[PDB]
Amino acid sequence: GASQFFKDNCNRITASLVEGVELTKYISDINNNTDGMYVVSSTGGVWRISRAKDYPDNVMTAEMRKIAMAAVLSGMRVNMCASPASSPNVIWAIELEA
Amino acid sequence: GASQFFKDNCNRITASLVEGVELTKYISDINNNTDGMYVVSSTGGVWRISRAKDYPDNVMTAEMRKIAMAAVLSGMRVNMCASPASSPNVIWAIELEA
Amino acid sequence: GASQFFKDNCNRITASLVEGVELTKYISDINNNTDGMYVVSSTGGVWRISRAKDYPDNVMTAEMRKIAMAAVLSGMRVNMCASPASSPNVIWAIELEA
Amino acid sequence: GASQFFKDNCNRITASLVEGVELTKYISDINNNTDGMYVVSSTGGVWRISRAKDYPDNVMTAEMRKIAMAAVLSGMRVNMCASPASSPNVIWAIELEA
Amino acid sequence: GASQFFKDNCNRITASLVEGVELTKYISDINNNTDGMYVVSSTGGVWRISRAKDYPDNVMTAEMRKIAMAAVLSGMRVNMCASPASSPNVIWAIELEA
Numbered sequence: 001g002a003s004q005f006f007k008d009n010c011n012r013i014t015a016s017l018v019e020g021v022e023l024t025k026y027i028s029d030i031n032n033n034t035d036g037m038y039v040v041s042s043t044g045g046v047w048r049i050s051r052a053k054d055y056p057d058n059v060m061t062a063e064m065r066k067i068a069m070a071a072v073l074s075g076m077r078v079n080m081c082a083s084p085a086s087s088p089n090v091i092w093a094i095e096l097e098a
Numbered sequence: 099g100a101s102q103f104f105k106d107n108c109n110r111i112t113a114s115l116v117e118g119v120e121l122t123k124y125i126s127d128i129n130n131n132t133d134g135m136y137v138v139s140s141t142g143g144v145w146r147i148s149r150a151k152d153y154p155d156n157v158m159t160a161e162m163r164k165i166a167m168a169a170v171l172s173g174m175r176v177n178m179c180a181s182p183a184s185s186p187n188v189i190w191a192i193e194l195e196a
Numbered sequence: 197g198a199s200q201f202f203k204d205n206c207n208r209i210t211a212s213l214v215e216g217v218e219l220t221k222y223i224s225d226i227n228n229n230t231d232g233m234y235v236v237s238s239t240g241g242v243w244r245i246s247r248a249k250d251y252p253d254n255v256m257t258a259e260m261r262k263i264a265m266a267a268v269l270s271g272m273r274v275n276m277c278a279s280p281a282s283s284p285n286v287i288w289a290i291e292l293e294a
Numbered sequence: 295g296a297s298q299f300f301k302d303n304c305n306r307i308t309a310s311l312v313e314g315v316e317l318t319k320y321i322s323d324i325n326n327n328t329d330g331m332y333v334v335s336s337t338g339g340v341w342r343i344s345r346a347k348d349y350p351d352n353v354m355t356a357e358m359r360k361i362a363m364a365a366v367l368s369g370m371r372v373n374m375c376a377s378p379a380s381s382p383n384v385i386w387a388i389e390l391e392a
Numbered sequence: 393g394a395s396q397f398f399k400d401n402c403n404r405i406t407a408s409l410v411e412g413v414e415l416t417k418y419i420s421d422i423n424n425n426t427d428g429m430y431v432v433s434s435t436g437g438v439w440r441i442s443r444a445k446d447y448p449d450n451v452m453t454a455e456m457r458k459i460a461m462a463a464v465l466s467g468m469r470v471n472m473c474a475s476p477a478s479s480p481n482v483i484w485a486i487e488l489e490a
């Protein structure tokens with residue numbers, strides 16, 4: 001049950017809408033090769049959270065990390081818009097649902 | 099119900115007062131043409147949260163994001179003072195109520 | 197009740213001590229004329245939270261906002277040292293109590 | 295009680311190990327000549343939390359603030375390596391305990 | 393247990409995967425010899441959280457510290473990828489598990 005606004009914003013062949021995901025793992029990694037921020041779902045799916053140096057994307061990425069860590073802490077579900085082209089798929093948008 | 103203070107400030111300007119809103123979705127988006135931070139109400143109404151690069155407004159915008167996210171986690175209601183100029187309407191002021 | 201330390205530091209020449217305040221609203225506002233961060237108590241008293249652009253005061257002002265929002269979320273009471281020279285009165289020190 | 299590691303790092307005559315402290319107030323002050331962040335224990339003990347502009351102490355001092363806040367909100371105890379003179383004392387290290 | 397993703401990435405013979413660690417202390421230290429951020433587990437094992445002055449690694453190390461603090465606050469277990477060459481061992485990746 002992603003909002004219709006969230007669905008409308010991720011409605012293209014080059015992006016994957018994924019709905020009602022339970023995230024159960026939140027990962028920070030600064031190892032070589034695998035550095036980044038990730039989440040893993042109850043199913044075992046993995047996404048990478050985008051990072052960005054400057055404004056405005058640095059506001060949105062910081063909020064993606066807060067959404068991700070709140071979902072893992074609370075068990076709230078998220079809906080995601082993600083790039084299918086990248087492995088793990090990179091999150092382009094995320095929706096935290098009560 | 100909105101504080102008299104908050105109602106008076108919103109009544110100064112042409113923006114519209116919205117009371118007792120229950121926010122159920124919080125969105126961060128870095129897609130190409132819908133980038134931003136947004137909230138979705140229990141009735142499906144959508145608003146964008148103000149963005150600002152610089153001081154002092156970036157203080158207030160950061161707190162609007164925290165108020166948004168707290169309302170979504172807690173189910174606390176919010177009152178908004180929202181501009182109709184844009185789609186979705188932009189939150190110019192918000193009040194978290196316990 | 198306010199700590200002796202908090203009370204001793206609130207210089208009565210320049211400010212007044214307010215004890216055992218229950219804050220029930222937290223407001224962020226970016227409108228042109230009512231610009232700022234505020235709190236509203238259970239009795240309708242309003243106060244403006246101080247902001248600063250530079251270190252070190254912006255460490256303290258960030259923590260005033262965290263105390264304010266935590267009090268509204270939790271119902272924990274605060275004590276304030278507030279200047280009466282503006283309306284709303286401005287908070288120059290705040291003490292969150294467990 | 296304090297970890298052996300924490301005790302080991304605070305084992306000198308000029309700083310005191312203080313264990314099982316209940317913090318019940320958390321103060322932000324920007325007033326003339328008392329500005330700073332402080333905590334008050336259940337028995338009336340006062341400490342200033344250190345402040346630092348630059349890396350790496352800006353990381354640790356920000357974490358000391360979050361530890362103090364969390365202790366006040368949760369009632370979790372802390373252990374401190376602190377100065378041994380009259381209140382208010384300074385803090386060299388702080389351990390939040392579950 | 394560790395996600396398959398997490399386990400796959402802790403793949404240097406010089407590194408150690410530790411699973412299902414319950415962290416019970418979170419330390420901020422600004423002493424001269426021992427400055428840093430640490431966690432202590434329910435069995436007394438100690439680790440140092442990595443630090444980084446600059447983007448991008450400072451995004452991940454900030455999230456390491458949020459993961460550690462959340463774990464101590466909630467009792468949620470963590471999985472770590474850590475380096476034995478050090479005393480205390482240094483965390484190069486960490487997975488918070490709901």
Ligand code: NA
Binds near residue numbers: 207209210211213
């Ligand atoms: Na006075």
Ligand code: NA
Binds near residue numbers: 304305307308309310
């Ligand atoms: Na000592």
